[PDB]
Every structure is written in C-alpha cells, then in structure tokens.
C-alpha cells in the first residue's frame, strides 16, 4: 500500500487531508500508511487527528530538522508539505519565524527528500505570492509580487523548491490556492474568528475600508485539488486551485453576520492592516483540465462550518481563551 | 564635522562592495565628499580586508553578520544609507550546498530590513542579480518580468528581493532593489569566470571554454554597476526594482576571444569542457530615464582588469591556493 508523509498534518488543512485520505475519500488510496510530522506550534492541534488516532503514525518534529527527516522520510511514496507559519497578522508583528519555517524549512525538507529519493513531493502554497490583480485571474505563468512578509516567505519557499526541481531533477509540484475555510480551523483566521466571537456575544473586527477582495474555497475542495496534483501532476510544475466565491471583506462580513445571526453593532472598525493587496484571484483551467472540479458552493460550506463551530465548543473554546 | 550622509555597506569587504566603498571614499560621486563609511562584513572565504587597505582612515570596519539583529540595532542608527552587498555568490557552491545561501541571501535580508525599519534608516538598497529571472534566449528583460531562477543561488537571491519588497509594501520601508548582469574588475575572487581565466593563464595553466561556448551573459564593469547603484540611491523610488545594464552581451565564445586578445594569449591554452542557463539580457529603460548610462566600454574595462591582475599576484596567489 502507498505510504504518505504529511508535514504540517496536525494543522487545519493538513489534518483535513489526512482525515479524508484515512476515510477513503480518494478512490484507489485505500488503507494507506500515513505518517504525520508536525512540530505542534500554537496552531498544531492533535485533537484534529483524534478520530484517526490509531490509523496514523505521529512524529513530533520540525521540517528544519534535517537529521530527523533523514531517519523518517525513507520508505514514503509521497511527501506533502502543509507545515508553515500561516497568519499574516503575525508575520506583520515579527516575520523571523515565517522565513525560518516557510523558506529554510522548505529547503531542509526538499534536500531531505532528494537524499531519501521520495518519488512525489507536493509543496502547498498560496495565491498571495502573486500580489494584486484588479481584473481577471492569474495563470501559473504569473509574476511573483508578494505584499506581506508571510506571502514573501511562501514565495521564497516555492522558488527554492522549483530551483531544486530544475537543478537536481527533484520531483516536486507546487500548489497555490486562495483562502480556505471549514471545520477545525484555528480561530485566529477571519471566518472562525467571527463565528467564535459572535457565538460568545463578543465583537468582531473589520479592517480598513473593507474593499479588499479575496477568493474563498472550502477545505475539502482544496484537498481534492491537491490529490489531483498528487495523482496527475508533473514534476517542476505549478498548479492553481481556485475559489468558489469571490468577495469583498465587506460582503464577507455581511455574509458572516447573516450566517450566525449577528448584528453590525458587533463589528469593530479597525484601522489599516498594511499592504498593497487589493485583490487576489487564480485561474485553475490548468488543473481542471486534469479533472479537478470544486463541489462545495460557498453558502452550503459556510452553513456547514457555522453548524460545526456551534456544535463543537469543546474544540474551540480552549483556543479562543488562549488567543484571549 | 559636515552633514554629508553616513553610509552603511554590508558586504563591503567583498568584490563589488569594496569597489563601491573605494569610489565613495575617493569622491567619485559628486556631493558625497568626506562621507563617513561603516563596513559590516563577516569575512567569509570571499571577504578580504586587503580590498580596503587604502581607505581605512575613512572606514569603520565591523566584523559581523547581517543575521545578527542585536548588532544591527546597535550599529545601524545614524546611517542615512544602507546598501546590502552581503551574500553567498558562487553558483557552483550553491549546487554543492544551498543551506548557507538561504541563510545569508534570504534570512539575512529579513534581518537587515527589520533592523533598518526599527532604526529609521531613510534610504536602503538591496543589491541583486539578473539571474533571478532564469534564461532568456529571446530578447531582453524589464523589471516586471516573472521570476524563474534555475539555481539555488538565484532562488535565494530572488527570495531576498521578495522579502525586501514586502517590507516596502507592508511598512513603507524605503528600500529599492537593483539587478545587474555579471560584474568584472579588480579585486574579484578568482573562482569567478574572468579572474579564473586570467589567473590560470598567468600561471601558464589551461583555461576552460564552456561547452559549445554558446552561453550568453550581460557583462558590466564594476564601476558602472556602482554608479548605477548610486543613481538608485540618489534618484530611485522606494518599492521599485531597477535594472542596471552593461555594454557587452557575449557568448562565452566571444568572451574567450576578448580575454585572449586582452592578455595577448593564444587559443592553444583553451580547453573545451562540458556544460547552466543559456542567456541573460537586461533592458534598463527605467534607470536610464533617471540619468544613468554605462560608461566603461568592454574592451577598455577588460584591458584595465588584466592590468590589475597582472600587477596584483600578491593579492590573488594566496586565494589561488584553494586548489
Ligand atoms: N489557511 C489558508 O487559507 C491557506 C490558503 C492557501 C494556502 N495555505 C497553505 O496551506 C498550508 C497549511 O495551511 P493551514 O491553514 O492548515 O495552517 P495552520 O496554521 O492551521 O497549521 C500549520 C501547521 O504547520 C505546523 N508547523 C508550523 N511550523 C512547522 C515546522 N517548522 N515544522 C513542522 N511543523 C510546523 C504547525 O504546528 C501546524 O500544525 C500552509 O503551507 C499555508 O501556507 C493556507
Ligand atoms: N559578482 C557578480 O557578478 C554579481 C552580479 C550581480 C549581482 N551581484 C550581487 O552583488 C552582491 C555582492 O557581490 P560580490 O561579487 O561582491 O560577492 P563577494 O563574494 O565578492 O562578497 C560577498 C561579501 O559578503 C560577505 N558576507 C557573506 N555573508 C555575509 C553575512 N551573512 N553577513 C555579513 N557579510 C557577509 C562576504 O564576507 C563578502 O565580503 C551580492 O549580493 C551578489 O549577489 C553580484
């Protein structure tokens, strides 16, 4: 049976990928052996994997730890890197750890994959590496122009992975996607922040003029796109996975308030968040040609996410208290 | 004593950085006379205090690492201009082991940009290379061009450019990026193409011609590169990239002929060896629109460079003992 190595698999998107793979949602990949490597930062959460606890081998570790990777990687058919620092606001406060994990950690992992001979490697990345597009969508040929330290670090990781592909023939593919939402997302991100604060009768933030535009995709659709790349993608190539809803932050705010029954009286207007980041939008014609298609309409996925947080306070309440 | 700006040069004991320092101290740039200069350099295999022997009365030297944020917080304040030449710069080394390239060329840049932000440094230049683009056999390049670096050195340099640009866009950090083709001139470490050729020929040894000799590169004399950088210092806009072009795009074949002409050598010494990227080409419309034009014609600069290596065996023979 195929043996899959998932770095960052105790976080939001990584744990979803693991739970889907272990549940048999990807036809063919049944009863796979699965190894999760995760350093369990503030964002790592083992409860995300509790339902597959006895199906997965968990190794606590840092993707920068080349010695540990050398022991653990060999024998795995597939490496997927979900390990990253991912909160833009944190990258604004101090970017040092973003460069360490999202650039140096990528080099460390790619070098360890080269030496261990892993045949399929997927580096998971973000549409924010491209910077703002006022009309239309970026294809995979688009120039990098990140605005935030988080996005510049993701971009730096992508560039070194592709240099390894071009220099050493490393069989790595890159995926890029817009903003994810869904169950088990750490409640510092905008959608779970809103839901959890509103369910507690507390305030929620609206940053700036609200006119920034983002693409929103349910985590299950992102992971299906990733699995498509695993099965049908080519070494050294980038693959976009595009949203199913494009929204200004004002529109997003209204949708979230409606979905939970909140009031605009709960919305704290907060000043500028720093950047040149008006609109991000990808074209995924390239991957849809390989057979990927999103299935989750935004309104249905949002409703399921609201119901999930409403029903799983025991999962998010300790996290809300830790954020304060 | 006067109010002429104080200039901080990271990597200033290297090839290009020490040239910039020497030009600045000599008074090559109008209105920058009497500059105080701080050089911060960790003196890797490529750093050389001999490169500054003549200007030590105007230069304060700090032996340290751009990744040392505490040190930067101490030494940066009071400098009006920060220029970053510190980097690992040999593509061949980056193939052997890229880890130090990422630490210096990416994490070191974030360290320096962050320390500049906290210190209130009003003008910053990140010095970079046309190698971030990857190969271009078809035409030339403008600063919007997409990034497709082929080597780990080029990818690390590209990562540095991006985090510097993110600091500009996120914080308004007043940093500009420059990108140029291959430099040549005095005080270049003899692992690089032209000084390896020259120094081996002077020791009676054979020199390489790379494959078909069809690979093409944009060549710029170090003094032109530095004058281009100073134009960005004086006239550039924060958050922008500027191309700095030289006066010779050459096949390796063409380059070999010029080198043999310049040293009075013969093709008997040239060995063809097996074969990186094919062609680098730079359009500098954005910076020429600011008054910069390259001024060293390639045949002239090469003749001066040959003169320099011929007269400086005491400098490069210890470095040649890398074999
Ligand atoms: N959340 C989004 O909207 C989004 C959108 C596009 C792409 N991405 C990318 O998807 C990946 C995962 O996203 P997420 O929302 O699940 O992030 P997350 O913040 O929920 O989880 C990150 C995981 O990585 C672990 N980790 C961090 N640094 C590590 C290191 N040095 N070594 C090992 N493990 C480490 C953490 O412990 C954590 O479990 C990331 O590469 C992110 O950049 C996310
Ligand atoms: N040589 C070229 O043809 C060329 C072309 C385009 C761009 N560039 C760029 O110009 C810059 C300077 O190039 P160069 O040819 O003078 O390189 P060099 O190898 O001659 O000098 C690099 C200098 O930086 C020092 N250094 C290295 N790491 C450091 C660190 N972490 N902290 C402090 N100092 C450190 C070294 O001691 C050395 O003195 C580099 O950023 C290079 O990428 C060079």
Residue numbers in the entry:
A (entry chain B): 1 to 324
B (entry chain A): -2 to 272, 276 to 323
Pull text from the paper:
Structures of EvdS6 were determined, with copurified NAD+, either without additional ligand or with nucleotide diphosphate. In these EvdS6 crystal structures, the enzyme crystallized with two protein chains in the asymmetric unit. In the ligand-free structure, no traceable electron density for residues R273, K274, or G275 or the sidechain of H276 was observed in one of the subunits. One possibility is related to a flexible active site loop that gains order upon substrate binding.
